[model samples]
Structure formats: C-alpha cells, structure tokens
Target: GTTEDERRELEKVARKAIEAAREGNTDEVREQLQRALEIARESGTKTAVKLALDVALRVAQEAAKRGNKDAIDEAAEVVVRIAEESNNSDALEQALRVLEEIAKAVLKSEKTEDAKKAVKLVQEAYKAAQRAIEAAKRTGTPDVIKLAIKLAKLAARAALEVIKRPKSEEVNEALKKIVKAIQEAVESLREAEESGDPEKREKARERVREAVERAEEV
Candidate 1:
C-alpha cells in the first residue's frame, strides 16, 4: 500500500535523524534519538521504567548543559519515580538532589500564580468544584449532612480560588455576592443538620456550590 515517493520521504526522515545526530544538533539529535529508540524498542520491552529512566537521565544531563531547569526538574522527577520502583539507591540520591532544587524554586514562587500558568489545571479545578457542588446539593438523610458539608466546603474553596484571581472590580463585586450566597447555603445546611433530617439541608449546600461554580466560570 506504500506509495514509492512516500516511502522515500519516510526513509529521508529516518536517515536525516541519523545524520543530524552525527552533526551534533541536540534538537534534531533528540528527534533522531527517539526515532532510533522507537525502532529499537519495537524489538524489546523498552517501556519498562528502568529503560525509560535511563533515557530521561541522559536527556537530563543534556538539558543541564543548556541550563534548562524545567526539563531537569521533569527528568529528576521521572528518575526518582523509576529509582523508587526499582529500588535503586544511586538513582534515588541523584533524583533527591534535583528534586530539592526544584522544590526550592517552587517554594520561591507565589502559590496562587502557579495555577495561572496552567490552563488545564484551572479547567480541572473548575470541573472538580462543579462536581463537589453537585454532590453537596444531593438530598440525603440527616446523617448524610456531615459528609455533604465537607463536600460543600471543597466546592466552595475551589470556586473561591478561581474567583480570587486578579481581575476587574466587576469580578470582585460578583465574587462578593457569590460569597454571601455560599455562606447562607452553609448556614442553611447546618440548621437542617440540627433538624435530624438533613436531606433537605444537603441539597441546600450543594446548590451553593452550584452557584459558586457558575460564578467561577464567568
């Protein structure tokens, strides 16, 4: 099914990676390296953590030479994981050093801003908040109020975190109303809990989470 020209082009890419490695271009080298490993691993179980860690360690050294801290951090984490899985002390020690450096750097960063750097993280948090809110709002018996309260808190916090982001006064105003609504919802649930039949209260707490989630999406 292969077209002659397409096959030739694929071969050219395969050959270029080899030639590129010989020329010492790290980017092309990695590309070629991956290609080579891909072909090689087709004949072996290279997906094993040990083998993957070996590749990561090599790339980590190369990344270090270029002062790429992010890559080093990622590699170190992978190395640590593999070392733990295989019980390799040497790898663990090296990984510890790298992780320590990364941790220090992370601690130095503003915690709140970390989310700003990851759009997917923000989205996931929003979704999780939505889920918890839904859970809290679910009607259950009096005893279920306690678990529902925890769920409500989780939803509220996640939604609050998003609303707390740097934004205009309108955002702040929206947040204020959202906060009051959440407080009322919590209070309403607490009272329902005292009523010995918490099903109605649980639904109230959940509705609060729903409101906060809506505000967060805005």
Candidate 2:
C-alpha cells in the first residue's frame, strides 16, 4: 500500500523536478524525475506511477521546448520503461507521445547525425505504437481502437515529416517501418470493424487512408 509518507515523498521529488526544469537544468530534471519514478514504483500504486509518468511527460515537454536532446532521451527512456512494464494502453500512448516530441526536436536539426538519431527515435516510436495496436486488439474496445488510430496518425505524421528531410539509407529504412506501422494500424481497425456495420468500416478506412496516402507519397 502507498503510505502517506511515500506520497509526500513523491510529491517532494516531483516539486524538485519542476524547480530543476524552471532552472533549465535538463540533467537534474531527468535525475529527479527518475527518482520520482523509482519511488512511485516502490509505492506499488498505479496512481503513483501515473503521477510520476505525468511529471516525466511534463519535464520532457519542457526539454523538448528547449531542444534539450539529452534530457528528452533520458525522459523518454524512463517513460518507455514504465509503459512496457505497466502494459497499460494509456501509458504506452504517453510513451509514444514522448517519442513523438523527441522526433520533432531531433528532426529540427539539419545535421546528418541528428537525422540518423531522428530515424532511430521514429523507429522506436513506431514500435511503441505497434504495441499499442496489439494492446487495442486484445481489448477490442472502440475507445482503444480510437486511441490506436490517433497514435497511428501521430507516427505517420512524424514519418512524413522525417521523410521530407534529406535522404539516407537509414532514413529510407525508417520510411519502410513507418509505412508498415501505419498499415498495421489500419489493419487492426479493419479487423475490429469487420464484425460491425459497413458504414463504420468504410468510415474507419477513410480516416486512415489520408495517412496512408501521405506516407505513400514519399
């Protein structure tokens, strides 16, 4: 059980992280947020874990705003770890969001190294989305499918953004992964809608078709 002391402690750590973010100390922000995550995990409460993750997400957003690559990477590492461990669809989507932010920051750089990093980050995000899709399939809930589609669009948009950059072998490979990830998202929606009416099925198809077309254009 999560005791009062543990909750207070987590709050304190989160406060420190916010202060660190205010000071623009990316490294310290990451360290404090990691500590918060550890404490949350130790508390063995889902709310604690969610709170820790939310803090991490906010900190990562700050890092993204400042274009702090290392901070973003560090925060993303924490988020992905928690998302995978928790196996919560919401957490997975949150992780994807973190990765999307990372992709955005990295893609802004014109350096070849940055491009390579962006491709890798996008690949990771795509994989995370795939997991979300799988998670959605098991539940077969319309809400989960909706979330998955949103994630699919996010990854697709990120992919399109990356593809518009200078070309490289690594980038090309990432494009293929992006296309496949989108297709899979659409496929899951197709399967989910198959048992339902045709109108809903066609509607879902039309929604994701925009993403497929844009990815194909590249």
Candidate 3:
C-alpha cells in the first residue's frame, strides 16, 4: 500500500479506537488500536508507526482518566510491543509515558491489589526507560543525551507518584528501581558531555541537575 493509503487506514482505526474508549468499551478499543498498529507496521515507515503509537498512548491516557485498568493494560501491552519492534528511543520513551499514566491511575485507587499492580507498573516503566537510555548511549549523540534526560524525567515523575502513597515493602522496592534508573540516565548524560560542545554540555548539566533533584524526592 502507498503511504497515503496506509495513513488513511490508520486514521480510521484510530478514530474507531477513540470512539470505543469514549463509550467505555475496552475490548473494542484494544482491537482497533492493534489493527492500527498492524497497518502502521505494514507501511514500513517510522513516521507512520510513531503516529499510530501516539494515538494508542492517547487512548491509554484517556483510559487512565476513566479508571479503566483493563483498557490501560491492553494499550500498554501494544505500546511495549511497538517499542520493542521499532527499537528506537522515541518509541521506548512513548512506552514509558503509557506506563507512567497507568501508574498514576493505580496510585489513585485505594485497593491493596492496585498497590501491588503499581509496583509491577513501576518496574516495567523502569525497564522501558533503561532500554531507551542504553540505546541512546550506543548512538552517543548530543540529541540522544536529551532523550536520556527526557526518559529520566519520566522515570522520576513515575517514582514521585508511586511514593505519594503509603509505603509497603513492595512499594519501597519499586521506588528504589525507579531512582536507580534515573541515576543511570544522569550518568549517561554526564558521559555524553565529555565530548559535547559547550552549549550541549551546559544543557545536559542543567537537565541532569533537575533529574537528580527529582530523584532525591523519591
């Protein structure tokens, strides 16, 4: 199929997924989004895949606002698959964003089960960010440092949200993993600054400073 044809189909699928989400039909939302992803992949264009994944992430964010844990899980699973398939920092970062939204939703729940789920989500998000950071390190470009900073900030935000609730051993362990991830990103940024231009080095330093402060809060 032509790129235009692929995009048109992806848009249709995304609209259906959004409609299903509005109607609170989690199953339909999942099915349509998955179809959109398949269409995007068949197009064999990074732009198409990123666009589809963004729509999926939006649906997941909406699902979180509606407190639809099942829908969030479904969307998150799709996002992770796309990230792994693309093997790019951008896709991996989007996956982290989806998981962070899930974590936020779980944080608002009062159930013990939700707390356990939060632990798992935090761990998953940490791993996702780690993958992105590692990929960025391999490229070793200044822009990749920015990606690492963005990922670290996301991980820090997730950690901050997870820490807002009362602490259990499970919660504590999750927070530890998140903080560790953020610190790792900061280290990556520092390494990048070693051969970076002055402006780039300063920008990396500034972002790393903020990331450290955020991690300290967790």
Candidate 4:
C-alpha cells in the first residue's frame, strides 16, 4: 500500500534495527516494529501481519544470538502477540528459540585491562567527536561541533588521570596522543563546523584515532 520510496525507507530503518540488535540493542527496533505492527493490524490482508511477524522474529533470534536473552524475550513477546493476532503458530517455536541460546558470546564482550580500557574510552570519545563533526558539516551548523571538542577534552583529561602511575612508554605515548587528538579535533572542527565542506574535520578525527592506536603500538 505504501510507495516504493516509503518501503525503501522502512527497509533502511529495519536494517538499522537489525544492526543495533546484533550489537545487543533494539530499543529503536522495538518502537519501529510497534508502529509497523499496528499498521499491520489495521490492514485487510494478513500480509502486513506476516511482515511484521517476520521482522520481529528475526530481531528476537538475533538478540538471542547476541546473548541478550532479555532483549530476545522482549522482542519475542511482541512477536507472540502479533502471531496470536494473526494466529501464525503464535510463533511459539520462535518463542522457544528465544529461550534456546544460553551462550554468552552473544552477550557483551569482556572488558580490556584497566589502563588499556581507559585509553579505549578516550579513543571512543574521539570517535564521537568525529561523528559530531560529520553531523555539524552535513547541517552547516557550528554549535553542535563544540560538543566534539568538549567530549575530547573530557576524554583527554581522563587519560591523564589514569596515567599517574605509567610504567610503560606505551602508556605515556597514549597519553600524548590523547592530548594531541584533543588539540587537533578542536582546531579542525572549531572553525570548520559551519564554514568548510568537512574534509578538515575528517582528517582531524582520523589523526586522533591514529594517535590513540600509536599508544598501543608497543
């Protein structure tokens, strides 16, 4: 009933949900499906119902595989509801499968060591700044780009905090990169946030990631 364009948009959103679920998150997926399921409920053909059911089923399965059993149950419970409304096996097997996977592999991965994890956190902060730069450029807005600099500053500060007892040159080097990435990100994004096309920001963020990697080179 929807236009091809609308269907494609919906498919993109569905793919995003799947990726998030694989990463052990489907909060967005749940909401997205709720709307789809409601539409399915109103449709004269059971096709909408089936489509929604299938999407929910896959989310449940993938969530289970990700070892987020709660998320699996959460997604499947809705699947069951949709199935009941459509009388489609009540998707009972799908529900059972949700309970089937117990491996923690699908669960969140183990954390790295203390010093390493702290460095990783700084790297993540730099990445967030990069994303912000991308958004800022795409919108031709500079205000939001400030967030990148702010996050980088906090991350760099945190790196400094954890390095008080540095035993390895690697630790000291990582600390240096944190500061450098922060400075470069601020310089690159501060002026170009709303002015330039965005390459400067990309290079700046790229430089930060490399800096972080160098800290671990040892």
Question: What order do candidates take by TM-score, descending?
Answer: 3, 2, 4, 1
Query: How far is each candidate from the true structure, as Cα RMSD in Å?
Result: 14.6, 8.3, 8.5, 16.1
Which parts of model 2 have CA positions greater than 4 angstroms off? 1-4, 24-26, 64-67, 101-172, 175-179, 185-218
Return the top candidate by TM-score: 3
The prediction achieving the highest lDDT against the true structure is 3
Model 2: per-residue lDDT, tens digit, 14-131? 7787667656686788789779878867776677777777777666556556655556555656666666566445555555665565455455533367566565757665675777
For candidate 4, the TM-score is 0.36
Off by over 4 Å in 1: 1-165, 195-218
lDDT (tens digit, per residue) of candidate 3 on 1-218: 34676767877887788777766798899899889788767776678777877777667667656666566556666765665566455555655666566555554443466466565657665665676577567767867656664655546454444534435555556566655656655564655557457876666667656655555455
Worst 10 residues of 2 by lDDT: 157-166
Clashes of 3: 0
- TM-score for all predictions? 0.24, 0.54, 0.56, 0.36
For candidate 2, the per-residue lDDT at 122 reads 71
lDDT of each: 0.41, 0.62, 0.63, 0.47
lDDT (Cα, tens digit) per residue for candidate 1, span 1-218: 33465334435544564344334355664554354344323433323333344444454455444544444444444444443333322333333333333333332332335323322332333334233344344645444444333333333333333323423445344434544444555455555555556677677657655655654454
